[PDB]
Design a protein around this ligand. Structure first.
Ligand SMILES: C[NH+](C)c1cc(NC(=O)CNC(C)(C)C)c(O)c2c1C[C@H]1C[C@H]3[C@H]([NH+](C)C)C(O)=C(C(N)=O)C(=O)[C@@]3(O)C(O)=C1C2=O
Ligand SMILES: C[NH+](C)c1cc(NC(=O)CNC(C)(C)C)c(O)c2c1C[C@H]1C[C@H]3[C@H]([NH+](C)C)C(O)=C(C(N)=O)C(=O)[C@@]3(O)C(O)=C1C2=O
Ligand SMILES: [Cl-]
Ligand SMILES: [Cl-]
Ligand SMILES: [Cl-]
Ligand SMILES: [Cl-]
Ligand SMILES: [Cl-]
Ligand SMILES: [Cl-]
Ligand SMILES: [Mg+2]
Ligand SMILES: [Mg+2]
Lengths: 195, 195
């Protein structure tokens, strides 16, 4: 079939949904594309470089709230951005494991910069804004990893596992997110007081 | 060498530090123990069951703040428990990836129950206490995963990557933790007011 960048990524995401990250190989990617392994090698050198590219394209295709709206609060932006990040990660099998370990790509340089300058325009230091941005990322990735990778009790534990089951963990994620944003807001409003 | 449970786990953690999770196999475990693969098979059926056991023993050996001290605040307990969880996860190469996906073991039933009852004794609903406990776990695992799995910039991004480098991410982790606990405390003190 066609082996432009877009078709190779399309095939690899479709294979990812079929096999998961551990089972995704260049050999099964060559099979799905109806080509020999050395043909594929011209286009994609190894599994490392494939996963790096998926990680970037899944966010390019499906993370539609990278940027704040005109006049949006920093609280509302972090909320929307976290929900968008979570959705994009959940959209493919093992999607969070695909994202894990990746550093911003040159193609998202300007996005991450904008996020950080935006927080600095709203009264954060670069440091405090970085802390807030990393805490949202680390909380969101952790939540989606346990959700995806989870794919004679004592009473509380029994009832709790029941509660976590009754939805995907969207409730626990959205509640924790509100707690993190409020804690950031309490820190920011304090200035130099003891808080 | 000796193949009691304790010696097999000792060998497997030492191999884990050598190879990482992806490179850890029952074949290299048999080699390190100076045995044949079918001998090992009697003791440990597969990689799945090995990793499940490591995940539990790393916390049994090295997570020493599973439980609150006599008279400890819920805020102080969650802080200490998060730092202890983080330390235990960092202690082995890919330790967070080993933990990821695991459900409490029967051997830790009574620990997780105690944590949840403790939060309920301090004014949380079972639900709100579960949310707080899962938010700490998801935030801690996310932070340690990016730390472990990370193993012509625009200005803010350049300076920020510099800041995250200057330590392991202990600063960003401890700051985010304070934000999460304060957000939980604001939620809890609100009762039925609009907050
Ligand atoms: C915070 N900046 C400086 C940054 C740093 C690193 N890497 C490190 O900290 C590396 N850590 C060492 C220094 C090696 C220990 C980072 O790894 C990241 C990021 C940025 C985030 C931005 C994330 C953001 N959302 C979820 C808060 C976002 O929406 C985007 C986006 N493309 O639209 C992201 O790319 C983001 O999800 C993301 O993945 C980030 C990083 O990975
Ligand atoms: C919250 N309880 C109900 C619970 C549930 C799950 N599993 C799920 O939620 C499964 N999710 C589905 C329902 C499949 C989508 C859980 O997976 C967990 C836990 C408990 C935590 C307890 C963690 C705790 N610290 C870090 C807050 C802790 O110190 C211990 C300990 N042994 O001392 C833990 O075991 C803990 O780190 C941990 O791993 C938990 C869970 O994994
Ligand atoms: Cl072509
Ligand atoms: Cl293309
Ligand atoms: Cl707003
Ligand atoms: Cl023996
Ligand atoms: Cl033993
Ligand atoms: Cl205390
Ligand atoms: Mg990332
Ligand atoms: Mg766990």
């Amino acid at each position: 079939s066609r082996l432009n960048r877009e078709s190779v990524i399309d095939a690899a995401l479709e294979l990812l949904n079929e096999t998961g990250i551990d089972g995704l190989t260049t050999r099964k990617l060559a099979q799905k594309l109806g080509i020999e392994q050395p043909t594929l090698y011209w286009h994609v050198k190894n599994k490392r470089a494939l996963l790096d590219a998926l990680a970037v394209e899944i966010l390019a295709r499906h993370h539609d709230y990278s940027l704040p709206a005109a006049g949006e609060s920093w609280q509302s932006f972090l909320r929307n951005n976290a929900m968008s990040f979570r959705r994009a990660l959940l959209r493919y099998r093992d999607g969070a494991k695909v994202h894990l370990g990746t550093r911003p790509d040159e193609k998202q340089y300007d996005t991450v910069e904008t996020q950080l300058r935006f927080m600095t325009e709203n009264g954060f230091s670069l440091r405090d804004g970085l802390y807030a941005i990393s805490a949202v990322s680390h909380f969101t990735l952790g939540a989606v990893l346990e959700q995806q990778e989870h794919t004679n009790l004592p009473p509380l534990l029994r009832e709790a596992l029941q509660i976590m089951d009754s939805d995907d963990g969207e409730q626990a994620f959205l509640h924790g997110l509100e707690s993190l944003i409020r804690g950031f807001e309490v820190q920011l409003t304090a200035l130099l007081q003891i808080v």
